[PDB]
Write a protein that holds these residues in place. Structure first.
Motif: not given
Lengths: 421, 429, 429, 428
Positions: D368-369, D358, D363-364, D353
Motif C-alpha cells: 500500500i502506497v 514505491p 506501486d501498489g 510515496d
C-alpha cells in the motif's frame, strides 16, 4: 583617538548557554564604566561584538536577547555583528570548517573595525577564534598595525584524560605560534593556573601574557544575602552544581557519591543542568541518600548554599581552567552557610587561596570524604574566619568590575608600548 | 525602502589588475553612474560594494594609487571597497582549499553585512575563489539571506578541456551547482551562449537559475578607435611585415598544455595558401612556432609582446585579410569581438573555430567565417574569405560591427545583468 | 618476538632526489646492512620500509631508475618501498593543507600496516608533510599504535627567519609538538644542537621526548677523498679563476623568498677586502648575483650546477682562503661539514655565520671563524682568516677535520638514532 | 588473470549498526558463490575489505566479528584492512577531515591492491569514500589504469528538508565530476529511484551508471517461516496488549537529517481505534513516548530488538501491517525483509510515496502506497483493513514474488559483479 574593543565570542547574544555567554552579559553591564574610565585615559571607546550566526532553532537561542544586546551596543555607537561560520547555526562549536570560517569572518570584523578606528583591541575567545590573530597579522597590512590581539578562554592542554580534537590542537597551536611570533598578539589568561600552564605548555613569553581573570559581578542582586525565612521558603548538607558530566568534562559528582557512602549523616545535593540517570544509578549502587536536581535557578542555589543546614559546597572538576562557581559560593555564603571544598586541580586551589579560604582536597573518594570531615572538624570561630577570608578574596581578587578594567588597562598600556617601537 | 546594493566579489581589480576580472571591474565602474540612473528609473537607489582579497603591496600588479581611485570612486557614491581576509600572504590572487574557503567566508560576510543595512542585495560573485559564497550566505544567514540574490559567474570546472581542475576548484564549483538547484536565490551568471548550454547540461543547472552576464567589450573606449591608413602604416612599419602579402592575424597567449590556441593550424594551412602571410603575436616569444614555420617553409611574421594599439593597426590595415581564432574551447573569448569592432571600417574579417563561444560571436557564419579545427579546413576558410567580393566583404564587415553593437556592448550587457538580477529578485518575492 | 621495522616517511629520495631529505635517504640505505648487523647484536631482526609520496614522471628530480634501485635494494632485504597517495598532481613534493593531510594519513596507514605484521615499529617521519603521522597513528591505531615509537625529524616551524611559515606548516608542526608532549611514544628527532635547544624552548618539548638524529656526512664516500695537487689544478683550470687572488668559496641553492643563503654579504664585504676573489656556485645561474657583484665593482667567479668533484678541488686548493656559510638560519646544514672534511689536508678554513647550526659545526670558533651576518663583520672574518698565524691555521684545520670525525659522521649518527630509539622503545615497556 | 574486488566500507566488520554493515554481511556470505561465478568468466577473484579504524568503545563494536571477517577473508586469500581516518574511532561518520583522510587511505589500499593484481574493481561507499576515485585516477599513473571505480551508497540530493553538510556536498560533487570526466569511474545505483535521481541531478551519463541494487539474501535462515507456536513464544516478552492489531515499524532513531516517519504513525493512530503501533528503534526513544503520550496512543516502544523477534512480530496474524514512512530512503531493504518474511502469514506493507519505497511495493500491487501525512497514513491503515481476505492473500503473494524477482541479493550482487567485469573489458 578612537578606540575599539572587538569581542569575538562564540555565544552570548543570539544564544546564551555557558561561561562565555555569562562573560558577555557581565561585560556589557561594565561597558559604560569602562568607557568612562578609558575616556579619562584619553580614548573614546566603541564596543563591537562578533558572534557566529545561529539559526532560531538552536539551544539557548532568544531573539529578544539578541535584540536587547544589539540595541545596547547600537545606542553607544557600537554594533553587534553576526558572523558567517560555514555551518547550520545550531551549535556554537564544530571542527576545522567552523573554526576556519569563523576565524576568517572574525578577522574580517577586526580589520573592518580597524579601518574606521585609530586603535583596536581584539579580544578573541576559544579555539573557534584562535586563528583570528594569525589571519589578521599575516595579511592585514597597515590595518593590522592598529590592532592588539588578546586571545582568551582556552588553549588545548594535556591536563585531562580526554585528548582534544585535531581541530582544537591545530587552531590553538596556531595562535600560540603567533603569540610567540608577533608583538601584537597576547594571550589573556583567566586564572593563575592557566597563566602558568600556558606559559609552560606553549612557551608563551611572559610579555605576551595579559590578565582576563575569571571573576563575578558581586554587587549583582543575584548575590544578595538571604534571611532564613527566604531560604526555607525557596528550598521547599553538601552542595555541588554545574553541567552534566561528559566525555571531556568530568565534573566530579561521582566523587561525592562514592565518598558519601562512608560519611555518616552527610547528604549530597547535586543540581545538574539536565537530569542524570548515571548519577541516579551511582547513588543507588551505594544506597547513598543523595538529592539529584536538574535545571535549578540560581535564586534557589543561593538559598541552598546559604542555609545553616549546608556544610560545604564541593568543586571536583578534573581541571577547571577558570571556574567562577566556587567564587559564587564563597560570595553568597559571606554571612552564613557553606564553606568551599575544592579539588587540587585547575584554578580551584587559587580560588580558596590554597587552604586559607576553603578546603583543598585530592581527587579520590577517600580524600574527598576526609575533606568533608576536615570542614566538619572546624570550630565555630574557624568557620567564621575562613568564611570571612573567602569573601574578602572574592572582593579583592575576583571582582568582575576590577578584573575587566585590569584587562582594559593592560591592553591599552600594551598598545602604547608596541606603537612606541 | 528602495535601497539596492550590488556586491561585486572579485579576486582582483582594485589593489591588483592582471587579467580579465580586473578589466571587468574597471569597466563596471565606468558604467556605475549610468547603471544608477537606469535602476533609479525602475524605482531603486543603487549602491556598489566591491570586495577583493587583501593583497600585499609587493604582489604582481599591485598599484596603491589605483586602489585609492577605486575606493574614492565607490565612496563618492555612497559605496565602498572592502578588502577581504583570505587566509593567505596576499602575494597571489589564487590558492587552494584554505584560500577559497576563507575568501568565500569573508565574501559571504560582506554580503550579509550589506544585507543588514539595505533592502535588497545582488551578490555577484566571481570564480571558484568565491563559489561557496551563495551556499554560505543561504545556509546560515536566515532573514538577511532572504534579501539576497546570488549571481555566480566567471566559470565552472568542466570536461571539454585537457586541463583537469584542482580538487579545490571541483568542490567549490560543485558546491555552487548544488546551491542553484537547492535554492531559488542562487543563479549562475553565464557569459556566453556556449556556457549557458554547457552549464545546464554539465551541472544540471536548472533553466531558471541561468542568468546573463554575457562577455562584452567597452565599445567606446579610446583603444577601439578607427585609425587612418596614415596612422596604421606608422604603427605597423616597425613590425617586420613583408612588402607584399595578405595578412591573417592571430594573437593571444602562447599555446600550452591544457590551452591549445591553434596557431599551428594557421601555419600548416598556410603551406597551401599562396600569397597569405600569417602574422602571429603571442605573449612570450615562440621557438616552436618559428621552428614549425620553417619546416613548412611558410613566411609567418611572428611577434613577441604587442600593444593593442599595434594589433588594432594590423587588424584595420587594408593589407590584412582575416583575423583567425582557432582555440580549442574558449568559454568567453572577447578577442574576436575586438577584431570585429576595430575592423568596422577597414581590414580583417574574422575566422572563428566552431568551438566555445566563437560561433555565437560570428553569428554562425553571417558575421564571420566558421571553420572546423583542421589544417585543411582552416585553409578552406581562408580561401572562402579571399573569394568574397568587395561587397560580400563589406556586408560581412557591417554585420560584424553591428553584432558587437547589439550583442557584446559592455554597457548594455552589464545593464542586462542588473535588470535580470532585479527582475529575478522581484520574482522570488 | 624479534621482528623490528623502521618505517621511513620521506618526501623525496627514491622517485625524486633534489635536496637534503633525498641525501639522507641515500646515506641511510648505504648504511642499512651495517645497521641490521648492529641491531642484530641487540636482539632485533631489522626491516626497512620506505614511504615516499607518489611522483609524476614529469616531476623535477624524477628518476625511474633510482626508484627501481631503491625498490630492489629494499626488496632484497625483506623491506619494501611504498608510494603514498598525497591528493596532488605529483609534481611539487610539497604543498598546503590537502597535500600534508593526505600524505600524513597514508603515511600513518603504512605505519599501522607495518605494525600489524611486525613486533615493533620505529616510525621516522620527516618534515611538515608527515608531521601529523604520530598523532594520527596514536589517536586511532588502538593496540597497533602501542607497537610504535615515533621519531619526527627534519623541521618545526620557528621564528628565526624573516619569512613566515605557512598556516599549513604552523598547524602540522603544532600538531606533532602536541603529540610529543602528550604521548610517551612520540619523540622529536633533533638534527643539531641548535634545534634541540630551539625546539625545547619554542615548543616546550620535554627532554625525554628528544632523540638524536643529528645531521652528518658519510665521511668515507669516495667523493670526500684528498686530491693530489695534480688533480686539484686540473679540475679548477676549467673554471675561469683569476691568475692572482685568494678565493673565498660559497655554494648551495640560489637564495629565494624564504631561504636567505647570504651570498650577498660576501659580495658587499669583498668591496673592503682586496686580493679576495669570491667564488659562488649556485644550483642554477644567478643573474642577480652578477648584477650585485658588478654594482659593487667586485670580481667574482659565478658558477652553477657544479659537480661536487670540482667544489672539492676548489676547496682543497691552497689558493682558497676560506669557505663561507652565511645562511639566515639553516637548522642542519651539512655543507660546512663537507668543507671541513674535504679540506682536512689543505685549502679552505670555514667561515660560519652565528645563526642556525653553524656555530656548533665550527665548535664556536675552535674549528672555523664565527661572524655576525653583516658585510662589515664578514669582511672582519675574512681578515681574521688571513691575519691567522701559520700555526693557528693548521690547528683550526686539524680541529675542523676531527670535529667531523667526532660529531658529524653519518654511520655513527644514524646508529646513534637507531640505538636511541630501540632504547626508548624498551623504556616504553 | 588476477581480479580483485576492493570493498571500501564505513562499517561491516569492527562495527555493525546500519545499512552498509548489512551489505558487507551479505557480501561475505556470497563470497564463495561470487568467485565460482567469476571463475566461470575467466577471472581468479580475491576480496579486499577496507574499513576505518574504530576503537572498542564505538557504538556497535565487536572484536569477535572483526576476527571472523578478517580470518574468513584471509582463509580465501583475501584481506580485511583497517584504515586511518584522522578521527577518534568512535563513529563511522564525520566531516571534511574524516572524509579526506579515509578517502586518502582508501585510495592507497586500492593502488596497493592494483600493484599485485591485473585488474581491480574498487567499490567505494558513501561520502566518506567519495573522493577515492578521483584520488586514484589523478595520482596513480599506470596502477590507476587497472582500476574501475564503482561508487555507491549515496549522493547529496535535494529530497530532504535537512540540507546535507558542506562536507557531503563537496565529497559527492567531486565523485560526480570524476564520473563525468573519467571512463573508469561509475556510480553504483541501489534503486530505481536513485538511478533516475542521480542521473538527473548530477548529469551522470547512462554509460557511467552501474547496478548495485538493494536486495536481501532470501535463503538465509533468519528469513525462515515461523510456526505460530514459535511466533507466540518469541513475542510473549515484548509487552504486547492482548487486544489490538499491530502496525510495526523498526529501524534507527530519527535524527537531524534522518526522518524515519515514526511520528506519522503515532499521529495517525489517534484516529485508528484498535490499532497499536509497535515501534522498535535502535536505542530507546523518549521523544516517541512523549509523542505517544501527547496523542494518547497506546504504542509499544521497543529498542535493540533482534531480527528473530522482528520477524515473529511480522509473521504474527495479529499484525495488520509493517509501515515504512521515511522521508526519502534511497535503498532501504527493511520493507523487502518484511515482504519476504510475511510470505505465508502476517503483515502487508505500507510504503511512503518517496524514495525507493514505491518501487519496493510495485506501486501498489505488492503493498500500500501512502502520502506522508497523518491523515494519509491513517487512510492507508484503513485501506489494508478493507482488503478482502482473498485480496490480502494475493498481495502477500505478489510481495513475496517481487522479492524473488527484484531483490534477491545473490542475483543483484552478481548483476554488480557482471556489469563491472563487462565494463572493465569495454575500457580496453
Amino acid at each position: 583617538r578612537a578606540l575599539a574593543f572587538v569581542w569575538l565570542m562564540v555565544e552570548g547574544a543570539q544564544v546564551a548557554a555557558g561561561g562565555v555567554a555569562g562573560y558577555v552579559r557581565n561585560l556589557l553591564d561594565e561597558q559604560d564604566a569602562l568607557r568612562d574610565h578609558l575616556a579619562e585615559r584619553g580614548w573614546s571607546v566603541e564596543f563591537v561584538l562578533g558572534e557566529p550566526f545561529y539559526d532560531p532553532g538552536a539551544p539557548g537561542y532568544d531573539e529578544e536577547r539578541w535584540r536587547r544586546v544589539r540595541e545596547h551596543l547600537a545606542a553607544r555607537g557600537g554594533r553587534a555583528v553576526r558572523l558567517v561560520s560555514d555551518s547550520d547555526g545550531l551549535d556554537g562549536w564544530g571542527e576545522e570548517r567552523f573554526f576556519h570560517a569563523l576565524s576568517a569572518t572574525g578577522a574580517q570584523l577586526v580589520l573592518d573595525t580597524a579601518e574606521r578606528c585609530d586603535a583596536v583591541v581584539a579580544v578573541s575567545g576559544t579555539s573557534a577564534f584562535a586563528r583570528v590573530p594569525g589571519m589578521v597579522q599575516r595579511q592585514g597590512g597597515e590595518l593590522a598595525a592598529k590592532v592588539l590581539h588578546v586571545h582568551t578562554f582556552g588553549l588545548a592542554t594535556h591536563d585531562t584524560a580526554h585528548v582534544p580534537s585535531p581541530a582544537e590542537i591545530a587552531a590553538d597551536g596556531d595562535v600560540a605560534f603567533w603569540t610567540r611570533q608577533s608583538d601584537r598578539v597576547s594571550v589573556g589568561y583567566i586564572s593563575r593556573y592557566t597563566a602558568e600552564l600556558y606559559a609552560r605548555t606553549y612557551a608563551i613569553p611572559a610579555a605576551a601574557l595579559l590578565p582576563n581573570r575569571s571573576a563575578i559581578p558581586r554587587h549583582a542582586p543575584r548575590f544578595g544575602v538571604l534571611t532564613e525565612e527566604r531560604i526555607n521558603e525557596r528550598i521547599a548538607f553538601v552542595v555541588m552544581w554545574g553541567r552534566n558530566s561528559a566525555p571531556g568534562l568530568d565534573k566530579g559528582y561521582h566523587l561525592l557519591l562514592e565518598a558519601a557512602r562512608d560519611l555518616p549523616g552527610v547528604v549530597p545535593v547535586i543540581a545538574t543542568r539536565r537530569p542524570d540517570p548515571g548519577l541516579r544509578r551511582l547513588a543507588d549502587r551505594y544506597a547513598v541518600p543523595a538529592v539529584l536536581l536538574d535545571d535549578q535557578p540560581f535564586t534557589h542555589l543561593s538559598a541552598l548554599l546559604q542555609s545553616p543546614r549546608t556544610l560545604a559546597a564541593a568543586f571536583l572538576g578534573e581541571a577547571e581552567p577558570g571556574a567562577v562557581s566556587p567564587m559564587e559560593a564563597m560570595w553568597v555564603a559571606r554571612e552564613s552557610g557553606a564553606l568551599v571544598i575544592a579539588a587540587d586541580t585547575g584554578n580551584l586551589p587559587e580560588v580558596v587561596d590554597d587552604g586559607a579560604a576553603g578546603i583543598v582536597t585530592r581527587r579520590t573518594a577517600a580524600d574527598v570524604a576526609d575533606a568533608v570531615r576536615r570542614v566538619r572538624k572546624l570550630t565555630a570561630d574557624e568557620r567564621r574566619r575562613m568564611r570571612a577570608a573567602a569573601a574578602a578574596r572574592v572582593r579583592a581578587r575576583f571582582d568582575f568590575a576590577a578584573n575587566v578594567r585590569e584587562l582594559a588597562d593592560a591592553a591599552v598600556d600594551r598598545l602604547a608600548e608596541v606603537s612606541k617601537l
